[PDB]
Design an enzyme around this catalytic site. Structure first.
Site, PDB file in Angstrom:
ATOM      1  N   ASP A  22      33.719  32.870  40.586  1.00 23.56           N
ATOM      2  CA  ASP A  22      33.834  33.821  41.675  1.00 23.56           C
ATOM      3  C   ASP A  22      33.331  33.400  43.164  1.00 23.56           C
ATOM      4  O   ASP A  22      32.113  33.686  43.198  1.00 23.56           O
ATOM      5  CB  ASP A  22      33.551  35.278  41.348  1.00 23.56           C
ATOM      6  CG  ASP A  22      33.553  36.339  42.171  1.00 23.56           C
ATOM      7  OD1 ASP A  22      34.161  36.056  43.535  1.00 23.56           O
ATOM      8  OD2 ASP A  22      33.002  37.446  41.928  1.00 23.56           O
ATOM      9  N   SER A  28      40.684  32.107  60.074  1.00 23.01           N
ATOM     10  CA  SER A  28      41.906  31.836  60.271  1.00 23.01           C
ATOM     11  C   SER A  28      42.310  31.556  61.964  1.00 23.01           C
ATOM     12  O   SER A  28      42.090  32.525  62.391  1.00 23.01           O
ATOM     13  CB  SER A  28      42.885  32.237  59.329  1.00 23.01           C
ATOM     14  OG  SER A  28      44.160  31.865  59.366  1.00 23.01           O
TER      15      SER A  28
END
Length: 330
Positions: A35, A199
């Site tokens: 994770d 992004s």
């Protein structure tokens, strides 16, 4: 040194991925959920409340000759999906894919929430976010990666998750045969303890690319792609019959639909998520309403590039002095 381990979807939907991890001496192999959105290595154990164990493999520290109680240390964690666990702490030898760390903090669960009990395939978590998020008190502990880093050939790990197929976690090297083209690297902020990046935009299907900054985290421990409501609405508007269902808890779509792809930007590069990666199947057995793999982050408080996004890429987690993230197509 290096390590290389195969990671395997837990079910037919790729809801999560498990990776075998050797703990203790002799080794006890547990299947952990790696994770990159958390920083505790915790396991089901011989200390876990019996009624909360249902099929998981447990770590028994008393059977490990290298286990040592970390005196006074406790841990307690709550995850974004509302699940939780807590317990005490041992140090022991931990190996992943041939890479060994001695003295790793292994957090032994005394209690786990129902979501964990109900998933027999996940024996614990191995956190790979920054150690500043580790919950051990009163002395915070380091992640497996943080402990291994100095010994690694290069201070990196890579995630190569499969779509409906196994993939690979590598430590200490970049497998140049595992991706196509070049890896585009992008800046990371560690201010919140995550692999947080921005992004450069998105496209839906064959549509034009929208240049827009989307700050989010690269999180292997989250199944879906969680993005701003504007982006998510633009995606689902291209699927006839798709709608947001408050009763189901997100966007659903007719199972008869063909889903468009979704592209996200990494600098000037583009990662394309095929439409099929966005299908999470019937909302309940036999239903013709299917759950979407792109959902709104509104009210999570953060955008999350979870498995839906990451499995479309070869992803480099560069833990150099100034960390960065790399993405390549594959």
């Amino acid at each position: 040194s290096t390590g290389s381990a195969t990671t395997t979807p837990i079910d037919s939907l790729d809801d999560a991925y498990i990776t075998p991890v050797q703990i203790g001496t002799p080794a006890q192999t547990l299947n952990l959920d790696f994770d990159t959105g958390s920083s505790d290595l915790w396991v089901f154990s011989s200390e876990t409340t019996a009624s909360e164990v249902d099929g998981q493999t447990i770590y028994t520290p008393s059977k490990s000759t290298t286990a040592k109680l970390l005196s006074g240390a406790t841990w307690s964690i709550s995850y974004g999906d509302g699940s939780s666990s807590s317990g005490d702490v041992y140090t022991d030898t931990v190996s992943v894919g041939g890479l060994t760390v001695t003295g790793q903090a292994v957090e032994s669960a005394k209690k786990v929430s129902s979501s964990f009990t109900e998933d027999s395939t996940i024996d614990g978590l191995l956190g790979l976010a920054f150690s500043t998020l580790n919950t051990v008190s009163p002395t915070q502990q380091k992640t497996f990666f943080d402990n291994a880093k100095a010994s690694l050939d290069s201070p990196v790990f890579t995630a190569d998750l499969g779509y409906h197929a196994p993939g690979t976690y590598n430590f200490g090297f970049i497998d140049t045969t595992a991706y196509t083209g070049s890896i585009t690297y992008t800046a990371v902020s560690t201010k919140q303890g995550f692999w947080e990046w921005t992004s450069t935009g998105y496209a839906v299907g064959s549509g034009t690319f929208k240049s827009t900054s989307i700050d989010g985290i690269a999180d292997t421990g989250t199944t879906l792609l969680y993005l701003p409501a504007t982006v998510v609405s633009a995606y689902w508007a291209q699927v006839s019959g798709a709608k947001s269902s408050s009763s189901v808890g997100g966007y659903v779509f007719p199972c008869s639909a063909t889903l468009p792809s979704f592209t996200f930007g990494v600098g000037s590069a583009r990662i394309v998520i095929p439409g099929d990666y966005i299908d999470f199947g019937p909302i309940s057995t036999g239903s013709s309403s299917c759950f979407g793999g792109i959902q709104s982050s509104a009210g999570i408080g953060i955008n999350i590039f979870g498995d839906v996004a990451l499995k479309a890429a070869f992803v480099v987690f560069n833990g150099a002095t100034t960390p960065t993230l790399g993405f390549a197509s594959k």
